């Protein structure tokens, strides 16, 4: 079903990146990404549609284009006003030129499915259009995500989706108990950062089958977190272990131990061009002079030009902050001590629809 192609497709996405990004953080919101391509199949046809829909994970076979979008429109309804059930908005958006009218069946699918609002720019005035479409994702994200576009090819067409997330953890690190601690980035770089602490009663596993010991903490409401932390030297194997039979395996684990936890108050935030990610999932016939965009306009002919995600994410001792953000532009074609001072990995989901809402690979904390 679609929470596991969500699954699926999250932790393929994170994969890829991984490897093409060593080096530096990674933080993303898979189930944005996801949003996002999908209120875009809707645009498209013919082999541009079908590879597009099958490297989200859905096979057209088992599944038509109907029942994939009333579902995504049942998750965009469960996301889009925040509660305390799940303190979270998400929304997409479509800025469009002046000069092109969106197609009526797909003008009423975004409308309907996604909640897209559909704003008329002039895009020939790209300083104005793109500052405009900053200040959106700015107003939106609560001014987390700031500077969208830096700086800059133009287009004719934006597709904009942006996620913010708010997650009091049901367990608080205990304010005192906070000391800068050393954290060992690589062999030759050490970082000072505030290392958190609790000692409580936390499901805890030290994996058999994976070089790994991890936690899951709830927040209050629907989201949960897993906090996993590869045997140094050992990231690769665990990230290369990722997936919907893990996180069941590592779930039939857990078990409630004492823990003294350590965690840093992480600050990161990342910029990710998924052009090439995609393509190599096999989502390809987008970016090419022959990208199939037929169900959006009549008026050009299009292909995506770029795909980019920033996401920002914030630990301290209440809880969670994180941000997200995605434009596609188109143009005409014993207590067990838990010490996290070093690269770990941070997956947070809606326990409710299991998405995953926002997916880490911590390198550096500050
Ligand atoms: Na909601
Ligand atoms: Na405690
Ligand atoms: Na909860």
Same mark, same amino acid.
């Given at each position: 079903g679609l929470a596991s192609a969500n699954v699926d497709f999250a932790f393929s996405l994170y994969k890829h990146l991984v490897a093409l990004s060593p080096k530096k953080n990674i933080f993303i919101s898979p189930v944005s990404i996801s949003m996002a391509l999908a209120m875009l199949s809707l645009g498209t046809c013919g082999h541009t549609r079908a590879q597009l829909l099958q490297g989200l994970g859905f096979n057209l076979t088992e599944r038509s284009e109907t029942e994939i979008h009333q579902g995504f429109q049942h998750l965009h309804q469960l996301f889009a006003k925040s509660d305390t059930s799940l303190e979270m908005t998400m929304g997409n958006a479509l800025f469009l030129d002046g000069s092109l009218e969106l197609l009526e069946s797909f003008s009423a699918d975004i409308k309907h499915y996604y909640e897209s609002e559909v704003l008329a720019m002039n895009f020939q005035d790209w300083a104005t259009a793109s500052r405009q479409i900053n200040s959106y994702v700015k107003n939106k994200t609560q001014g987390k995500i &700031? *500077?969208?576009?830096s700086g800059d090819s133009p287009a004719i067409l934006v597709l904009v989706n942006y996620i913010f997330f708010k997650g009091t953890w049901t367990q608080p690190f205990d304010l005192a108990s906070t000391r800068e601690e050393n954290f060992? &980035? *690589?062999?030759?770089t050490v970082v000072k950062v505030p290392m958190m602490l609790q000692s409580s009663t936390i499901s805890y596993l030290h994996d058999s089958e994976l070089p790994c010991q991890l936690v899951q903490m709830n927040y209050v409401g629907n989201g949960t977190v897993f906090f996993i932390l590869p045997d140094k030297g050992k990231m690769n194997t665990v990230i290369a272990a990722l997936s919907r039979d893990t996180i069941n395996r590592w779930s039939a684990g857990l078990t409630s131990s004492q823990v003294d936890l350590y965690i840093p108050k992480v600050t990161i935030s990342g910029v990710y061009d998924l052009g090439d990610v995609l393509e190599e999932m096999?989502?390809? *016939?987008?970016?090419?002079?022959?990208?199939?965009? @037929?169900?959006?306009?009549?008026?050009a002919q299009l292909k995506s030009s770029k795909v980019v995600h920033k996401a920002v994410l914030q630990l301290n001792e209440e809880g969670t902050e994180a941000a997200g953000a995605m434009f596609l532009e188109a143009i005409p074609r014993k207590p067990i001590i838990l010490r996290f001072n070093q690269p770990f990995i941070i997956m947070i989901f809606?326990?409710?629809?299991? @998405? @995953?809402l926002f997916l880490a690979r911590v390198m550096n904390p500050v």
């Open positions: &700031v *500077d969208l576009f060992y &980035v *690589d062999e030759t096999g989502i390809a *016939d987008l970016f090419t002079t022959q990208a199939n965009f @037929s169900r959006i306009t009549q008026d809606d326990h409710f629809t299991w @998405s @995953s």
